């Protein structure tokens, strides 16, 4: 149809939306967005927004350092251009704030999301982003109240429940987390009686229960919960990681290494497993593989303070005291802007 009559912009916009959807293609979306922007004023703003979203999605699935920053800058430029071309749409401001929050620039993103809330304050995603951003500023009660109000408005969501569980575990105690988890299980049972989504939700519920149990020092209950959860998916990386963690807590430091290796053999991009493996290997005595693992981790991602702290600690025993000091400083300055959960959990869909 585009070939037949190159006059309208709705057709390429729909094509780009379909390309960006569950089919998970990126180049065609880029081509459609460029075609739209090549040709009133609303349509070009929508094309700029789509191009920025495509750039952000491409940046998320990168593999090295520089192009990540390049694509982030391109997405920020596209978002600010779209906002300039049209200042009367809350979606553009919300997406601009979400993109800006990735670069850890907190006050500017907070101002932009405040303006977006000013335009419209009934968006569940806006409230969730506000609570997540307040979490990074170390104000737990305010975020808890925000999540409570969001739950009151939408008493059947799922992501907000997970955020509430995590915040309660970090702030109030384990009993509230247990009550929330059992309420979530009751809600899931009531809502249902094909798609893999219910199974993954149940698995996540069981994993969160195992984690809240492992935080108090009762390995038997956590082991039982994770064994029950593993009946559905016996080859997931999460269950292997949890088994490695419970073995680590048990006191036997041989099977934990095997579990971590098995988990890493499935998902090479996992971060926590490799950090735990490096920490275990450090006290063993070997200082040759740990540095390589930490360098690979810092190459894959450069937004975690734990890996920087571990690298500094392991390098302290090597001799380069200045490098260890600067790594410690980097880890400390990075920890000041660490949210409770990653910002990427919020979906980015046109």
């Amino acid at each position, epitope marked *: 149809c585009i070939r037949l009559k190159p006059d309208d912009a709705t057709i390429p916009l729909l094509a780009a939306k379909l390309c960006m959807g569950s089919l998970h293609w990126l180049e065609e979306a880029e081509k459609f967005a460029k075609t739209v922007v090549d040709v009133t004023s609303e349509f070009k703003a929508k094309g700029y927004l789509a191009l920025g979203l495509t750039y952000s999605l491409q940046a998320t699935d990168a593999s090295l350092r520089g192009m990540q920053e390049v694509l982030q800058r391109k997405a920020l430029l596209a978002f600010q251009r779209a906002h300039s071309l049209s200042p009367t749409d809350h979606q553009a401001a919300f997406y601009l704030a979400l993109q800006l929050a990735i670069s850890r620039q907190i006050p500017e993103a907070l101002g932009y999301v405040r303006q977006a809330l000013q335009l419209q*304050g009934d968006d569940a995603n806006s409230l969730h982003l506000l609570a997540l951003l307040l979490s990074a500023q170390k104000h737990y009660h*305010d975020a808890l109240n925000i999540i409570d109000m969001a739950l009151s408005e939408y008493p059947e969501n799922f992501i907000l429940l997970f955020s509430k569980v995590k915040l309660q575990s970090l702030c109030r105690g384990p009993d509230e987390a247990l009550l929330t988890c059992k309420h979530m299980l009751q809600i899931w049972k009531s809502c249902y009686n094909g798609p893999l989504h219910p199974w993954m939700t149940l698995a996540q519920i069981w994993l969160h229960a195992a984690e809240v149990y492992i935080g108090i020092g009762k390995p038997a209950e956590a082991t039982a919960c994770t064994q029950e959860a593993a009946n559905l998916f016996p080859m997931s990386h999460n269950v292997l990681y949890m088994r490695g963690q419970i073995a680590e807590l048990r006191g036997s430091m041989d099977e934990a290494r095997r579990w971590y290796e098995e988990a890493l053999a499935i998902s090479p991009t996992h971060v926590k497993s490799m950090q735990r493996l490096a920490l275990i290997l450090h006290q063993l005595g070997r200082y040759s593989l740990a540095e390589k693992i930490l360098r690979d981790a810092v190459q894959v991602n450069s937004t975690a303070h734990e890996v920087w702290n571990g690298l500094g600690e392991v390098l302290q025993a090597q001799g380069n005291d200045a490098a260890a000091t600067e790594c410690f400083l980097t880890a400390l300055e990075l920890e000041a802007s660490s949210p409770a959960v990653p910002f990427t959990i919020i979906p980015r869909v046109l």
Partner: nanobody
Amino acid sequence: MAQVQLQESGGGRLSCAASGTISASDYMGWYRQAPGKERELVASIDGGGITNYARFTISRDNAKNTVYLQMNTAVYYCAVDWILARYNFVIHYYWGQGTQVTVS
């Protein structure tokens, strides 16, 4: 980096001063707490000039980011609050320690 601290004086022309920069959109309010009584919002003001009372005259200086109150027994509190109240919400972003005032 710069932490925002609030200094209140005049208890015994009340003054409340902050060493940092506060946007005019944020609300600044006076609260009262007396022994045996609950927290009560007494006065509020924005950067636009509209003031809400439940007697006193208030002035805001943006150049120095200060508030003065002229009057004619409790702890008074100066707070920096956000409204965001399509449905009557309120949050206390900054809460001070207050100062005791006794009236015979």
